[PDB]
Amino acid sequence: GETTDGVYRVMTRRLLGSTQVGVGVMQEGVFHTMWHVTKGAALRSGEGRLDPYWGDVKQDLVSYCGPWKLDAAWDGLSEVQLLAVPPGERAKNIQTLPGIFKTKDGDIGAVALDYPAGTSGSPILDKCGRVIGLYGNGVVIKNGSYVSAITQGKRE
Amino acid sequence: DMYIERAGDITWEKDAEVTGNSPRLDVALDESGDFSLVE
């Protein structure tokens, strides 16, 4: 069906009406999203079908039609934009400076913007418009707010 | 059955709404891909 590069909404008709479960990125004929959005299930794009190709529950990432294509990374210094696609609302760029998730296996960038869980899969961008990661996997802080990591896959 | 709908282009927007803080947090990632706070 629609294979054009860009940001897409991931929807379902299983619940009441049409519900937005997440968001994803189409790039180089590959659909990239977060694992918790689709659970590895097949996707529909008009009359066409997207079958999963690669996935990992720990990284919380999944690619459809081909291997993960997104290889840009946050430089640890400059501001980024969350191209947020919220349920029932238009795509919107939100500029912020990322924080840090300090882990036993290294540091990761983190965006502190509050959006519904259906916004999961929204791409985080660098100044050149390159996707440096996906929004939707993080932690809940002392004030109920969500702080997501900048989750990036590995390009082979 | 899940489906996809195009929502726009992937572009950087100059003069976008600039908001949000930059916190430094101690986290742990489990086998299920869930993050948790370490103190």
Ligand SMILES: O=C(Nc1ccc2c(c1)CNC2)c1ccc2sncc2c1
């Ligand atoms: O529940 C959420 N995320 C999630 C669910 C299940 C799993 C994982 C993450 C990773 N391991 C499995 C959540 C909560 C709040 C917000 S706000 N914007 C995105 C967002 C995602």
